[PDB]
Amino acid sequence: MDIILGIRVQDSVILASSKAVTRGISVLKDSDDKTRQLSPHTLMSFAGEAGDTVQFAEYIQANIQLYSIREDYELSPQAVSSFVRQELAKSIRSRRPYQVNVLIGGYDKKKNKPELYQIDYLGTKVELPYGAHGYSGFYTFSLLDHHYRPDMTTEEGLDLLKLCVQELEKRMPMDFKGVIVKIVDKDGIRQVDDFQAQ
Amino acid sequence: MDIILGIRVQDSVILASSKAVTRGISVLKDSDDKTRQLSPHTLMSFAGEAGDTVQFAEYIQANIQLYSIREDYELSPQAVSSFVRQELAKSIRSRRPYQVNVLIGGYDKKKNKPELYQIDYLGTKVELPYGAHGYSGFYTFSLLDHHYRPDMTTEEGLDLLKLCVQELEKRMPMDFKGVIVKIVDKDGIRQVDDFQAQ
Amino acid sequence: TTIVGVKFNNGVVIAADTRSTQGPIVADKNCAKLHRISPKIWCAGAGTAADTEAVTQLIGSNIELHSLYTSREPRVVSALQMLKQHLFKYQGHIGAYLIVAGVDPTGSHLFSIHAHGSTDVGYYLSLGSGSLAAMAVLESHWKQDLTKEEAIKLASDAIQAGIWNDLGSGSNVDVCVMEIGKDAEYLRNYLTPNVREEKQKSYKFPRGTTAVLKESIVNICD
Amino acid sequence: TSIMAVTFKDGVILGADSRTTTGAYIANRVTDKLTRVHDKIWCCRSGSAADTQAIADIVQYHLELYTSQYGTPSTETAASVFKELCYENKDNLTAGIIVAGYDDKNKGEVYTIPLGGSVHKLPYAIAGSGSTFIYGYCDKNFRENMSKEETVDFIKHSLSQAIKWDGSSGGVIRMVVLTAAGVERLIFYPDEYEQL
Amino acid sequence: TSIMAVTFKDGVILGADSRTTTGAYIANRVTDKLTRVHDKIWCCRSGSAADTQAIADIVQYHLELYTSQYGTPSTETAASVFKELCYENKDNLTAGIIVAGYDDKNKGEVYTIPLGGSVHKLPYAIAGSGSTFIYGYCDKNFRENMSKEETVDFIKHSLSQAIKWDGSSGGVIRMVVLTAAGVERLIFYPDEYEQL
Amino acid sequence: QFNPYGDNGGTILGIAGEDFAVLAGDTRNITDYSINSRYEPKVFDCGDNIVMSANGFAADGDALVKRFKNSVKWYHFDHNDKKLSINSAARNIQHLLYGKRFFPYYVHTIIAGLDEDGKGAVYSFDPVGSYEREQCRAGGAAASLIMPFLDNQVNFKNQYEPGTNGKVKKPLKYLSVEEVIKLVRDSFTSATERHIQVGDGLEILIVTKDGVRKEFYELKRD
Amino acid sequence: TQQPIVTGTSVISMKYDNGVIIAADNLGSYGSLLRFNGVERLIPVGDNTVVGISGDISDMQHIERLLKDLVTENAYDNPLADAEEALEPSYIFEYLATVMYQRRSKMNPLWNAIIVAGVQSNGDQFLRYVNLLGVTYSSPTLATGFGAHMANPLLRKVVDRESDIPKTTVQVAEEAIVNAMRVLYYRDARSSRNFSLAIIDKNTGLTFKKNLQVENMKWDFAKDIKGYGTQKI
Amino acid sequence: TTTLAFRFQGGIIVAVDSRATAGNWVASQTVKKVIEINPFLLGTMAGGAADCQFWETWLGSQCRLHELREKERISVAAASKILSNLVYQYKGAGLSMGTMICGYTRKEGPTIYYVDSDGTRLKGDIFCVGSGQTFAYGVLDSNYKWDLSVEDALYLGKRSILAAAHRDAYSGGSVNLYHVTEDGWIYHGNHDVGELFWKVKEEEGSFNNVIG
Amino acid sequence: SDPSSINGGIVVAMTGKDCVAIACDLRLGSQSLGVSNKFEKIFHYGHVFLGITGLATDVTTLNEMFRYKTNLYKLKEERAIEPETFTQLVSSSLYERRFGPYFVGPVVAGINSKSGKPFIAGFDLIGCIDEAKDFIVSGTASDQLFGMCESLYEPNLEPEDLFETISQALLNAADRDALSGWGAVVYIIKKDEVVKRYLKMRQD
Amino acid sequence: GYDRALSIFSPDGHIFQVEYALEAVKRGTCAVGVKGKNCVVLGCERRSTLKLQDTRITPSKVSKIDSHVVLSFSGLNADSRILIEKARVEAQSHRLTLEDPVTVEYLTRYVAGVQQRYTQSGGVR
């Protein structure tokens, strides 16, 4: 599968997502951004079935933006993830389920704390310090189980991810073409344009 | 599959073979040499079924060396490839066939001409200017159909391969971990230790 | 499971063992398999437990409403007809196999229903994995014009054959007697021939044996 | 199962064994396969017990409502309702039904509705797993306009043979005589027909 | 196919229809199913024609070599050779064989070797697809020690019924009478037995 | 199609003491939901102070035990009546089992005796020869119900020294033959309560430097 | 690997104070066709053993030939063939069990369920079972096929455990066996009314009764039963 | 199962877990997944319990026969090939094994060979084999240096198997450590995860998720 | 494939002297991959406790469903739902999805506020109620739990004692199951107070 | 099929076929080998019963078994070919399974074994 990683440090949540989009024998694109901003402080990454993936991300984005406008308020990260979980949980028992896994990284301005939610296509949600979807988790959970620390700074988090991406670029069979990294904190969502060699 | 490429220029045959050995979710080795020297002027590269691959290569090597000692002579490239083809052709109709594809690059000291033979596990043999096994061929045959020239020098051949490897490292889904390049000419077989950035 | 139905001179009786199992594991060593459709119409089921139980309560609910609407006592043939038409509709997907018995203004009745919706009438019946052991007994001792006492014995002996010889059955025997002129009498654990012997030792652990990482009080009040 | 219906001088007679099996196990050894859908219109069932019972119950319902509005139905009409149910629902049904009835105008009649849902009027009909064994016997011994005693004998011998060779048939032999005189139920135990 | 062998007062008689089909097509309407493995030891074949012919040919070979060394073989011995072949090769064979022979000491005898390769000595035997339809008829009409004329009649009626209900049976009825007097071949055409 | 394997139920248990060892097993033999026998020995004395039980498909268990007993016999014939040590028996069993690696003896086997130092020893095997020496082991139908219990009561798993803040583990003092027989009996009465293939009887074989002794206890027959 | 064609149903047995009793009906089924009726499924070996066989009949006949050969072969160069060296029930069983397991091990089973009943030379009763898988077991009562489900429950009410053996007489036992055969005739659709029964007593020897018939059957209550639920006539 | 072996400045480190399973059933927590072929040869086991145990014990007998015959310790290359060639004879029959043959010889120096039932035979410096392999690779790969001290190397190997025992449902029990120098292998104990985890957590401050 | 073996997990309830205990492990994995060691499976509505094993998404969904129903129930009835009543509510809610069931193994534990009587019950995925007086088990290590409970259990244990028994039952059963464990939490319930303790256990 | 015991013991304890085999060696052209401190030299003599040969093609007396080992002999030429071929095959097989060429003692031990075997196998001299 594609690489979808997330790590929650002291005051931010960082999401790293592979850039490759491959079909059969060809890597069609190497600059794919597997993410959608749901609200100024909530970001969602996704991996899964070819078309379902974006259709789901955009459908969720549309709903959150609608709520924001209607209520002139921003739902908390926990609120948004519960909404996403329910959508997936409905889907799994529908005619053709959405085959999409997501990571929701958000900064809760009311609690002043970053939050990372991992949710699979079945609607299985869990809140974690770090998470991953696909085969990635098989090399990153133990890596992070070892190197991760609660009080880490955003900069330490990025170095921690770099350690993850290097492990993946070493042992994973596929060429996922690097990752796009985004930070979610009290000031919003920004993209680290320099990870191709940080 | 693994990448097995071969190109015959003016006075040599160059073979390029991927270095990765992957099983399931893990790249177990990144310095694998998918080649066996059959005689001072004949080299064979191979790709295919996990264990059959080397067992076949070494079995062929053992036989050629035996012939060399018995006859105190070196079989021509064409002779060795016909021997290899027959072995594969027998195998395809046996209890458990060897699932191995090979490229045989040799320099015929009697004719003073390089020769490249492509042979699949069915015992299908053909002599070519350039050849490939696996999905590689799908991007390299047309590339070479365009850039290849008969009278090319060994150095031009290497630049031509570099063009091939770059295309493969761009569009192929798998990370084959680069290639090991070997040149076969009137002076024998030598390995280009500097291709990681030529 | 072993369930049986036996008609006697002035009524009908049903019995069943009390073993509930999930695969080869005994989940409930003393469940009650005898269900009530109405005060005097009792039922015993085998097969998908949730199904026998649900189908019994559904028809039971409608039988009550029908009784209130017609101002008449519920009839066994009504429970039979409603159960069978329901089961038939679900083409056997509702795995309920039942033995329904009871007394009503028209007399005493004994019927069997199968998951696909077919019904049978008889003087003695058995269903469940213990079906064959019980029937061997019934075919060996049943006779026409049994007395309430003989019936209780015959039915009780039938469940025992199942308890002892069938791995899908065991523990106790539950009975329910329905006599034409009286109230139905449910005899829970009418027999208890399988009491676990006193254990050889007590495994009460010395307090402190279990390592605890964190503790706290839980708020129940609002 | 072994079932048959035979028309004769005074009307028609239905007969059947009483065995119902689930595999090699006899779930009921005294089953009553002679089913009444109207006073003088009965049927013998074969195939899925759940199916034939559901069919019979619906037919009975239709004939009861028919009677209420247009009076007593002809045996042909009863066979028609069975047919409609069996044909229209052939994909989800496994029912072989023999309809037999006594009319004052038409006397005794027999209609057989096999698996497909087609209808066949006949002097007599046999069905059920045990029937294959008596095609020869019945064909050689059947005569039209037999007497009640002769018909009861023909059926008793035919079925005793069916019970003899077919493990799915057995128990007692039940019969229902349908004539202007009314309805008569007959039963014959093993110890009698086993030695014919 | 409808085949049978019946022992009687003077020996034994084998009878059979003459129809061989491949699907609903009649490949041969005048087949000869009465097969000779020895002078007075014949057999009726059912199942795979290729198989029963291969079996018969081998048995004949064995009885011929047996005779050469130990004289005329008993019908029991012939049934034994068939059995050995059918039992030992049950996985690759589909053959139902009825063996019938006349011995001077043992008179007429009948052995039936069904699908599994088991052997059964009987007063008479019936086999083939068409036989299911005459179990009742034969059971009711068979008597021991019948006369040649009675036996030929029993067989002619039984088979005409089998041919009547079974589409796989038909054509003419062939018979082989085996007695101390010798071997007699009989044939009966449709226009005769069809109206019995 | 033909299935060369069947499941005869049963449960076996082996515990090793400091200078003794026990191998126990219920005496019930089943097929599906029927009982074939309430008393069919499943634990055997194979000579040279070794007890063994091959539980699972009984025909395979019998063939194995029979083959091993004959193995011991020949060991004597070929090595001047030398005694077959438990460790040597274990390796031997491994080869017997692995010999049928492509058509396995469908059994879980356990053997018990004393090692060459007189200490109690238990060895359990995988259907194809995988084996290990252990302190205790449950095999058969109720293995999943009993092993946990043994890890707790025989090897004191998850148990700590009260008041040590779960810092000091409960010491591994060792069990006496009397304390072991209690754990065994309790294990089987528990197994008999929750597993339908366990019951009828319990037969224990105790091995010491003085040989093999046998004790028998009744179990619930339902 | 094969599939049974002509088959024999239940074989039931039990042991009493002085010996063992074993019975089996005389039917040879062909699917649901009750095809053959004079089939003896009880095979006496010598005068201290009777082997009851169920399952495929062609294989049963094969096991018969094997048993006759065992007798012939045991007689060879054996001056004590009818004395100290005659075939014991245990020898006959161990033999058959060996064959049954070898055959299932070659994936070509003798499709049968077998019960060997007899009295050992020392007077001990012998009752052991072996089937197509080579599985074997002993019990005071043993039955195959349907009889396992319906006969054992009845027979065990007479001898529930070993200690009930000495307290059981031939009369009680034979009665239990005969009743069980009737029950099987009621519920087993592959059973026959005719059957054989044999007794191997350590004093009276081997008694082999042929042509028995199930008698005293209750069918009268059938007349009262009509319809399948609501029908009244 | 999780097994690893890696080469470094001080020789070879071999670490394995000790859990045996039968599906989701924990069959054992005390199995030995390392076999001591001889004073300088170790073999690791993963895959089928019986297959590994049986064939690696057999391998030992073959290595011993070599020494009697050639009056010389067998090489790691030749030992690994005996197993590799044996297994290849059975290709297609269903054998299941992921193995590592690790040893020392004056002629080869510290050597590691990966050998599996597919017939694959690979020489290398680092290998992790088993259902938990990736978990071990995660920790091991991101802390490995050729210049680790025997002490640090021994710990990484131990910490890597610990990582795997924690995240892999099919790995656990205890950790068995080994160190290989030209004087042979040196056993470095059996470390129960039951205690090793909490100790490592406290002392290292890692496994920060789990609440303690 | 098997919805009940994807995530793993166990729950067990026991009755004691004027008390009840309900415990569960904390694991949440995806086949061999352990994913979360903080996934609790016990929830409560007023004084009624519910543990749920099986497919995690359904565990979460069912809890939100019962919180929702017990909330409305309280608003209408004007009292908190009792254990016996809730058990019926769970049963009918499960059976209502008879042909598209939630893949769970629910367990109810509590003390009837009016009778003070301890109560526990289990259910199969379609609602069949298992009402044992001693203990109820559920999850991937249910066989092991049945073994431990049948052996370790004895009537009328005092809270402090029932705690040791329930904990040892859970702990040792979980250690023989690859998909259970990774932490555990135990609830000791009494008419007046409820104590919640996190146990220390193997982390492999 | 042919398995007559050709090499058997005689009363004095000799095996004449092996003894006569040596006589065939004594009759063969001479061969010698001497080892230096850093080499080994092999010398052979050349018969002259008939001289008019083509030295280019006529099979030489010293044969390479592998690139680091040679073999010379005295005796029946036809026989020597058989031993040399088997040696060459064993050399390649050894490299294939041991991943190392044969030692000179190993290769010698192999040739010797083949010779011994032909002294106690039926049907062969």
Domain boundaries, chain I: 1-204
Give dist(CA I64, CA I28) in Å, integer.
18
Query: Distance (Å, rounded) from C-alpha H33 to C-alpha D124?
Result: 80
Chain C nearest C-alpha distance from H33 (Å): 30
CB atoms within 10 A of CB H38: 16
The full set of domain ranges for chain G reads: 1-233
Measured distance CA(C197)–CA(B134) in Å, rounded: 71
Tally of CB atoms within 10 A around E128: 24
Residue-wise DSSP of D35-81: EEEETTEEEEEEE-HHHHHHHHHHHHHHHHHHHHHH-SPPHHHHHHH
The Cα–Cα gap between E186 and E105 comes to 25
Cα C140 to its chain centre, rounded Å, is 23
Query: Which candidate, I8, I20, I6, places its Cα nearest to that of I183?
Result: I8
Tokens, residue H7: 């080469």
CA-CA distances (angstroms) from residue I26 to A75, E155, G114, I38? 29, 81, 54, 5
With CB atoms and an 8 Å threshold, state whether F126 touches H50: yes
CA torsion angle for H44, H46, H52, H53 (degrees, to 10)? Answer: 70
Is H163 assigned a ligand-binding role in the annotation? no
Residue spans of the domains in chain D: they are: 1-196
C79: closest CA among C106, C33, C111? C111
The experimental method behind these coordinates is X-ray
Helices (DSSP H) in chain I: which residue ranges? 56-77, 83-95, 142-152, 159-174
Mutate to test the interface with H, among I26, I35, I140, I204 (most CBs of H within 10 A): I204
Give the list of residues 6+ apart from residue G86 with CB closer than 8 angstroms, or none: G46, G48, G74, G80, G121
> What is the identity of the amino acid at G18?
N
**Which residue does chain F place closest to C164, by CA atoms?**
F222
| Shortest Cα–Cα distance, G93 to chain D (Å) | 29
Q: What does this entry list as its resolution, in Å? A: 2.5
**What are the residues whose beta carbons fall under 8 Å from the beta carbon of G149, sequence distance 6 or more?**
C132, C133, C136, F34
Chains C and E touch (3+ CB pairs under 8 A): no
Question: Could you tell me which residues come within 8 angstroms of residue A105 by beta carbon, excluding any fewer than 6 positions away?
Answer: A6, A8, A13, A14, A15, A42, A43, A44, A45, A77, A114, A115, A116, A117, A182, A184
Distances (CA, A) of C44 to B176, C23, C33, C96, F214: 67, 20, 6, 10, 45
Helix (H), strand (E) counts: chain B:
4, 12
Which of A27, A172, A173 comes nearest B171 by C-beta?
A27
Assign B109 to helix, strand or coil. coil
Helix (H) or strand (E) holding C160: helix C148-165
Question: Is residue B46 a contact partner of residue B100, using CB atoms and an 8 Å limit?
Answer: yes
- For residue F10, the enclosing domain spans 1-222
Q: What is the DSSP letter of D91?
A: G
3-state DSSP call for residue D132? helix
Of F5, F38, F63, the CB nearest to G101: F63
Tokens matching residue F182: 């209690």
C-beta separation of H203 from H159 below 8 A? no
**Exposure of C217 by Cβ count < 10 A (0-12 exposed, 13-18 middle, 19+ buried)?**
exposed
Nearest CA in chain I to C205: I164
- Domain B1-198 fold: Glutamine Phosphoribosylpyrophosphate, subunit 1, domain 1 (3.60.20)
CB atoms within 10 A of CB J60: 12
CB contact under 8 A, H81 and J99: yes
Question: What is the SS3 assignment for A51?
Answer: coil
CA atoms within 13 A on the CB side of D151: 27
**Contact state of F195 with C206 under an 8 Å Cβ cutoff:** no
| CA-to-CA separations, B46 to B118, B167, B178, in angstroms, rounded | 10, 21, 16
CA-wise closest residue to A60 among A7, A103, A112 = A103
Distance CA D81, CA B89 (A): 71
Task: Return the closest-CA partner of residue A111 out of A57, A29, A41, A34.
Answer: A41
Task: Decide: E62 and E69 in contact? Cβ < 8 Å.
Answer: no
Answer left, alpha or beta for residue H109, where phi above 0 means left and psi between -120 and 50 means alpha: left
Handedness of CA H103, H108, H112, H118 (dihedral sign): negative
Across I8-131, the runs of DSSP E, i.e. the strands, are 10-16, 19-25, 28-30, 33-36, 42-45, 48-54, 104-111, 118-123, 129-130
One-letter amino acid at I61 equals: T
- Amino acid letter for position D32: D
SS3 C32: coil
Topology, domain E1-196: Glutamine Phosphoribosylpyrophosphate, subunit 1, domain 1 (3.60.20)
C-alpha separations of B90 from B81, B178, E196, I198, J20 in Å: 14, 33, 69, 67, 45
Q: Is the dihedral of CA E13, E17, E21, E27 positive or negative?
A: positive
> Using CB atoms within 10 A of its CB, is residue G79 exposed (0-12), middle (13-18) or buried (19+)?
exposed
Q: Which two tokens stand for residue J100?
A: 């190392």
Number of domains, chain H = 1
* CATH number where H210 lies: 3.60.20.10
Phi, psi of A101 (to 5 degrees): -110, 145
Cβ pair A105, A8 in contact under 8 A = yes
Residue spans of the domains in chain B: they are 1-198
- Report CB contact under 8 Å: F130, H49: yes
The three-class DSSP label of residue H73 is coil
- For residues H206 and A145, is the Cβ–Cβ distance under 8 A? yes
Give every CB contact of residue D84 below 8 A, 6+ residues apart in sequence. Answer: none
Instruction: Identify the CATH number of the domain in which residue F111 sits.
Output: 3.60.20.10
Q: Which two tokens stand for residue E65?
A: 């070599």
Q: How far is Cα A151 from Cα I11, in angstroms, rounded to an integer?
A: 34
Q: Cβ contacts of residue A97 below 8 Å, gap of 6+? A: A91, A121
Q: Which residues of C touch H212 (CB under 8 A)?
A: 213
User: In one letter, which amino acid is H86?
Assistant: L
Number of domains in chain F: 1
**Which helix (DSSP H) or strand (DSSP E) does residue B166 occupy?**
helix B154-171
Q: Is residue C161 helix, strand or coil?
A: helix
In one-letter notation, the amino acid at residue B142 is S
DSSP-derived pairing of the beta strands I104-111 and C41-47: unpaired
Instruction: Name the phi and psi angles at G160, rounded to 5.
Output: -85, -30
CB contact under 8 A, G230 and C77: yes
Can you tell me the distance from the alpha carbon of G74 to that of G69, in angstroms, rounded to the nearest whole number? 8
Instruction: Name beta bridge partners: H128.
Output: H4
Whether H144 and H156 have beta carbons less than 8 Å apart is answered as yes
Residue H29 · residue H165 · CB < 8 Å: no
> Among all chains, which residue has been given the structure tokens 């059926």?
D155
Degrees, nearest 5: CA angle F99-F105-F108 = 115
F171 secondary structure, DSSP code: P
Interface mutation target, options H24, H28, H193, H204, chain I, most CBs of I under 10 Å? H24
G232 HSE (CA, 13 A, CB side): 5
Separation of alpha carbons D163 and E129, rounded Å: 20
Q: Which domain holds residue H153?
A: 1-212
Q: Which of F98, F102, F105, F130 to mutate to test the interface with H (most CBs of H within 10 A)?
A: F130
d(CA B94, CA F145): 50
H or E stretch including A189? strand A188-192
Burial of G69 (0-12, 13-18, 19+ CB in 10 A): exposed
SS3 call for C221: coil
Please tell me the distance in Å from J97's CA to the nearest CA on chain H. 7
* β pairing state of H11-16 and H174-181: antiparallel
In chain J, what are the helix, strand and coil shares in percent, each to the nearest 5?
40, 15, 50
Rounded Cα–Cα distance for residues H181 and C187 (Å): 79
- Structure-block tokens of residue H186: 């040196």
Contacts of G231 in chain D (CB under 8 A): 32, 35-36
Query: Which H or E run includes J86?
Result: helix J77-98
User: I72 to chain F, minimum CA–CA distance in Å?
Assistant: 39
Q: Is H81 in contact with H21 (CB distance < 8 Å)?
A: no
Q: Which residues of C touch I47 (CB under 8 A)?
A: 220
> Domain I1-204: which CATH class?
alpha beta
* C-beta atoms surrounding E87 within 10 Å: 18
Q: Which backbone phi and psi does F141 adopt, to 5 degrees?
A: -45, -50
Contact E11, E180 (CB under 8 A): yes
* Count, residues in chain I: 204
Per-residue b/e over B34-48, b at no fewer than 16 CB within 10 Å?
bbbbbbebbbbbbbb
Which residues are registered as beta bridge partners of F205? F23, F214
Active site residue G1: yes
Q: Which helix (H) or strand (E) holds B21?
A: strand B21-23
Q: Distances in Å between the alpha carbon of C130 and those of C158, C166, C192?
A: 9, 5, 18
Whether residue H54 and residue F94 make contact (CB cut-off 8 A), yes or no, is yes
**Residues G41 and G178 sit within 8 Å (Cβ to Cβ):** no
Q: Distance between CA C30 and CA C163 in Å, rounded?
A: 12
Give chain F positions within 8 Å (CB) of H49.
126, 130
Closest-CA residue to H83 (of H137, H131, H47): H47
Three-state secondary structure of chain G: CCCCCEEECCEEEEECCCEEEEEEECCEEECCEEEECCCCCEEEECCCEEEEEEEEHHHHHHHHHHHHHHHHHHHCCCCCCCCCCCCCHHHHHHHHHHHHHHHHHCCCCCCEEEEEEEECCCCCEEEEEEECCCCEECCCEEECCHHHHHHHHHHCCCCCCHHHCCCCCHHHHHHHHHHHHHHHHHHECCCCCEEEEEEEECCCEEEEEEEEECCCCCCHHHHHCCCCCCCCC
User: In the structure encoding, which two tokens stand for residue A49, read together?
Assistant: 């079935």
I109 conformational bin, left if phi > 0, alpha if psi -120 to 50, beta if neither:
beta
The closest alpha carbon to I39, from C219, H211, A80, belongs to H211
Task: For E163-189, give one letter per residue: b (16+ CB within 10 A) or e.
Answer: bbbbebbbbbbbbbbbbeeeeeeeebe
**Interface list for chain B against chain A, based on CB atoms closer than 8 Å:** 22, 24-27, 135, 138, 169-175
Nearest chain F residue to G132 by CA: give it: F4
Residue C28 contacts I where some CB pair is shorter than 8 Å: yes
User: What residue ranges define each of the domains in chain C, with the CATH number in brackets?
Assistant: 1-222 (3.60.20.10)
Do the beta carbons of residue H33 and residue H43 sit within 8 Å?
no
Residue carrying the six token digits 């009965």: D42
Domain G1-233 bears CATH identifier 3.60.20.10: yes
